Amino acid sequence: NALPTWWKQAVFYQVYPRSFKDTNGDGIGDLNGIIENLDYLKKLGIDAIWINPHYDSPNTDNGYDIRDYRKIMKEYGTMEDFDRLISEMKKRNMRLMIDIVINHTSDQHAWFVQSKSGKNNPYRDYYFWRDGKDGHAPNNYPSFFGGSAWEKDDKSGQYYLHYFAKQQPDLNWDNPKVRQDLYDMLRFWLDKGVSGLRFDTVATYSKIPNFPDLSQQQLKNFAEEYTKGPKIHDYVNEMNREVLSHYDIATAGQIFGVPLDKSIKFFDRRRNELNIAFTFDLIRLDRDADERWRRKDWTLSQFRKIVDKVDQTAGEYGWNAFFLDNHDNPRAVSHFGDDRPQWREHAAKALATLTLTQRATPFIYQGSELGMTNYPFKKIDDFDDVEVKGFWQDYVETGKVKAEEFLQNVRQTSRDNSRTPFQWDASKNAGFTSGTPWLKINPNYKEINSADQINNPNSVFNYYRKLINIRHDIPALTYGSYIDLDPDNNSVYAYTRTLGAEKYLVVINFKEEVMHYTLPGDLSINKVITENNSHTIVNKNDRQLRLEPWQSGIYKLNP
Ligand SMILES: OC[C@H]1O[C@@](CO)(O[C@H]2O[C@H](CO)[C@@H](O)[C@H](O)[C@H]2O)[C@@H](O)[C@@H]1O
Ligand SMILES: [Ca+2]
């Protein structure tokens, strides 16, 4: 029995404001650039937008190092602009989700400026300060962004903890005053009518008592160990009870590092924690858990097994999001498809069909609706991202990995592949900016741009538009149960979605050759709901499909 909600049936679109549309020529996108393109997202059929952080920030980590939670980022505009965004989405019946980054603040935040003053400052224990051991760090914790997770302060002689950049010191959630202050901050944004909150690295708020050294095995998988704090569900439930349950919102939790079997405690509706799971098992299936910048070969059978495990883990009482890329990962068509010119549009339409036929809330990352690709990074200085510089420092500058081997991996895995500016049209800089963009635009913008697709009925954009309309029209594509026809098949991905008598089949050929695919058991086709790249017609009661390379489709099955 499905408990339907607006957020289970929504299709979300993720805007990275820095790279969406610049309206004043400084080369950085801004809030007015979002406002000006709301009609575009409305034509796509999006009903909710999640924006990456929009707060005052020195931008060590592009908005994720927040200097003031109640001020708009200078580069993105003013509080008036923010209020106008809310008001214009409201006019269009679109709901806004903002990014909540409360594992850490900027080292420029008024709290940390006070805290670092001296052991006797009232704000001292808003952050984690510990003594060194034999004139080195308190323990062997590594940072996600390179080097040690402990930064020595000369004023006090103590180290402060930063799982991410040295400019992002971790907040001390063990102090109830910190949690209260964070709660007032949330009410500030919620009182403005925001409809959703995405919690950045939500599983790391609880730190391990006494900070023991990690073991050898643990250092190779430290992201999991940092999710092992003994109070994380107590804090998330407390936030639900004191804030989240008092408003009418959807909450998504980014549970990076949490083993899949432990994810349901954050999202089971009975636990009064969060609503929508962002899991990383799928999107990192081809990533090394230790040398986190490296990729490795993967197969469709691996990919489909993860889909099914993730689906089953949500079960009856949790709920998943589903996404294939985002601002932290390479573009879907390059990562999971074939981004060469012969195949790109077909593979993009095949991955859109996958996304929009999952038992999950789909998130569409900006530009994926056009089939944008990875960017051709050459040299190490072609990248912007703090994280890639941290990996370079840890692995290349130490002589552990050859520069060229590192680059062969990070060209494929870098976050910056998702962050090149949105390709609006075929004008100079793809119409993103009248100035010099902050990060160079992919030269494939003359082939891949929204102007060339919005009115072409055959485009990637219109195929997403069609799929979103189909999903809204067929309840089984949102709430139906999921069954993979053959989890070991590395050629043809085929699964059903079922609600009572109503059963649909999704079939995608991941091979660049014609595949014949015979349906199992007594299954036979009642109707074609949609196909891309097909050549052989499908008639009533067909029990076989002849799939062109990269062909994708949705069929309704006979009862
Ligand atoms: O590669 C990014 C790294 O950080 C995670 C959290 O583990 O991503 C979130 O947290 C970071 C620090 O606030 C942000 O830089 C990132 O953009 C945000 O999504 C994971 O995605 C990943 O391990
Ligand atoms: Ca701008």
Side-chain angles (χ1 to χ4, degrees):
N1 274 39
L3 165 75
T5 65
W6 69 265
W7 50 265
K8 286 177 186 181
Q9 34 199 83
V11 172
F12 272 74
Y13 187 96
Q14 176 189 349
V15 172
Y16 191 72
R18 203 177 169 87
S19 300
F20 193 64
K21 171 67 193 273
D22 173 18
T23 57
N24 70 344
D26 71 345
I28 297 159
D30 52 60
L31 300 173
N32 290 334
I34 308 180
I35 294 168
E36 157 199 305
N37 288 290
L38 295 175
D39 285 333
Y40 165 85
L41 297 177
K42 195 81 184 159
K43 179 190 332 278
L44 177 59
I46 284 337
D47 44 51
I49 298 173
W50 156 34
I51 57 174
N52 294 100
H54 60 276
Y55 321 83
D56 179 50
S57 171
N59 288 311
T60 292
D61 186 24
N62 290 352
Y64 285 89
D65 49 308
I66 301 176
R67 184 172 54 204
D68 187 339
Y69 280 116
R70 300 213 200 184
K71 273 195 72 184
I72 302 311
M73 195 191 285
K74 173 50 235 264
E75 288 90 349
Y76 295 170
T78 63
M79 189 58 76
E80 294 74 23
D81 289 344
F82 183 88
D83 297 334
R84 225 172 297 116
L85 169 73
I86 284 169
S87 147
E88 292 294 328
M89 284 180 65
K90 186 182 184 30
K91 290 185 26 196
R92 294 164 180 78
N93 300 123
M94 300 168 84
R95 293 189 171 93
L96 178 72
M97 171 177 281
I98 62 164
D99 210 312
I100 301 303
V101 185
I102 59 181
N103 177 82
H104 49 266
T105 66
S106 171
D107 67 339
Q108 288 185 40
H109 197 283
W111 309 334
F112 187 62
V113 169
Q114 297 170 87
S115 180
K116 69 172 211 284
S117 286
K119 295 204 178 138
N120 301 123
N121 191 279
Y123 285 96
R124 189 68 173 183
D125 55 346
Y126 266 51
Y127 299 92
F128 292 99
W129 286 100
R130 289 300 182 278
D131 290 333
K133 165 182 78 176
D134 352 295
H136 58 237
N139 65 17
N140 65 356
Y141 280 5
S143 166
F144 284 98
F145 292 172
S148 179
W150 293 104
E151 180 66 6
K152 171 139 179 189
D153 177 59
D154 278 314
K155 267 282 287 292
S156 72
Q158 277 199 306
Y159 289 76
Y160 65 90
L161 180 64
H162 67 93
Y163 286 164
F164 294 95
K166 296 173 184 182
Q167 299 81 5
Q168 286 161 309
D170 282 64
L171 284 162
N172 174 15
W173 269 81
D174 298 349
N175 179 347
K177 269 148 204 204
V178 167
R179 305 202 299 270
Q180 301 293 316
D181 266 351
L182 289 176
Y183 304 161
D184 288 342
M185 182 283 283
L186 302 171
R187 288 176 193 113
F188 171 90
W189 288 109
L190 291 167
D191 282 348
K192 302 183 155 277
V194 151
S195 297
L197 305 170
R198 178 264 195 184
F199 291 92
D200 181 58
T201 185
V202 68
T204 59
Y205 299 160
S206 179
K207 265 63 174 175
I208 311 290
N210 301 308
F211 295 119
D213 277 334
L214 308 166
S215 79
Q216 271 318 119
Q217 222 187 282
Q218 290 163 356
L219 282 170
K220 287 180 214 221
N221 187 23
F222 60 85
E224 188 170 320
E225 282 300 320
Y226 294 164
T227 66
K228 291 218 245 138
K231 300 231 71 186
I232 192 51
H233 299 294
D234 291 346
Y235 296 161
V236 176
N237 176 247
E238 182 187 275
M239 180 172 56
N240 173 296
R241 294 183 291 97
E242 296 192 25
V243 185
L244 306 183
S245 62
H246 294 249
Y247 292 84
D248 188 3
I249 55 173
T251 57
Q254 183 207 35
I255 52 147
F256 194 94
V258 171
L260 184 62
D261 33 279
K262 281 151 193 161
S263 64
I264 188 54
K265 292 206 176 169
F266 289 96
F267 301 112
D268 180 330
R269 52 168 181 259
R270 297 165 309 174
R271 288 188 49 96
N272 299 315
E273 290 189 34
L274 301 173
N275 294 130
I276 299 163
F278 283 18
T279 60
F280 296 76
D281 296 78
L282 192 63
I283 201 170
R284 283 189 71 89
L285 81 172
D286 66 334
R287 303 283 293 276
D288 182 320
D290 187 11
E291 294 183 296
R292 292 192 322 295
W293 55 266
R294 198 181 285 281
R295 54 69 54 196
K296 48 184 193 182
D297 292 337
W298 60 282
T299 66
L300 168 73
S301 72
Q302 190 190 350
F303 174 102
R304 74 203 294 164
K305 285 168 177 167
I306 289 160
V307 177
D308 191 63
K309 206 73 171 67
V310 174
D311 180 77
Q312 253 174 57
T313 295
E316 146 80 355
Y317 295 105
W319 189 256
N320 292 319
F322 187 91
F323 54 91
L324 296 174
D325 55 13
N326 67 12
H327 61 304
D328 286 335
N329 283 283
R331 288 211 168 259
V333 78
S334 292
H335 188 186
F336 297 117
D338 186 327
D339 67 5
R340 296 180 292 160
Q342 187 174 3
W343 301 124
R344 185 191 73 250
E345 293 156 312
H346 299 316
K349 294 173 180 171
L351 297 172
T353 299
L354 192 171
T355 300
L356 288 166
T357 58
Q358 290 299 305
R359 189 190 74 82
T361 299
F363 278 72
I364 298 173
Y365 180 67
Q366 60 170 51
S368 71
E369 79 277 18
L370 307 178
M372 285 183 57
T373 67
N374 279 354
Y375 176 90
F377 289 110
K378 287 310 172 214
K379 302 278 177 269
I380 189 53
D381 290 313
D382 288 348
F383 299 92
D384 163 72
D385 184 14
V386 68
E387 182 187 73
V388 86
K389 297 183 168 79
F391 286 135
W392 174 271
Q393 294 160 9
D394 284 346
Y395 286 94
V396 184
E397 297 192 336
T398 55
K400 274 167 64 147
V401 178
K402 285 174 201 187
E404 181 57 25
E405 183 163 346
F406 176 81
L407 289 163
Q408 277 167 347
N409 284 277
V410 295
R411 283 164 184 143
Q412 298 183 249
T413 66
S414 171
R415 309 199 296 174
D416 280 344
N417 281 296
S418 74
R419 297 171 182 201
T420 72
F422 193 97
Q423 292 169 192
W424 289 99
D425 69 19
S427 77
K428 181 176 201 185
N429 283 311
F432 161 72
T433 185
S434 61
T436 299
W438 79 270
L439 185 61
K440 279 186 172 57
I441 287 163
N442 197 312
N444 69 18
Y445 79 87
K446 292 184 159 152
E447 287 298 319
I448 303 177
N449 68 72
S450 78
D452 160 80
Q453 296 188 22
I454 57 165
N455 297 124
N456 172 3
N458 294 144
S459 65
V460 182
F461 174 92
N462 282 305
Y463 202 70
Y464 267 88
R465 185 175 71 75
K466 181 184 187 193
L467 291 169
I468 291 171
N469 286 332
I470 285 157
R471 182 185 177 80
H472 279 144
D473 279 349
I474 303 183
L477 299 184
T478 299
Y479 296 108
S481 47
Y482 169 85
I483 298 174
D484 189 326
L485 292 195
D486 187 351
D488 299 292
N489 184 323
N490 283 311
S491 288
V492 176
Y493 188 11
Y495 55 94
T496 59
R497 298 301 306 288
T498 302
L499 275 179
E502 299 301 290
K503 183 178 285 289
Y504 290 84
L505 172 68
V506 174
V507 183
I508 302 165
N509 178 15
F510 271 73
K511 299 291 143 130
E512 55 183 48
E513 294 169 1
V514 177
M515 291 283 307
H516 286 86
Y517 184 70
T518 296
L519 305 182
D522 214 35
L523 293 190
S524 61
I525 291 171
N526 185 261
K527 307 206 223 275
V528 175
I529 300 301
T530 187
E531 292 176 303
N532 175 70
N533 203 30
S534 63
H535 167 261
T536 80
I537 69 169
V538 174
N539 295 282
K540 182 72 170 24
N541 305 332
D542 275 357
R543 287 175 190 279
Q544 193 176 6
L545 297 173
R546 188 183 114 104
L547 310 166
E548 295 288 320
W550 283 107
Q551 176 169 321
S552 58
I554 307 172
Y555 310 87
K556 179 174 231 279
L557 298 181
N558 283 320

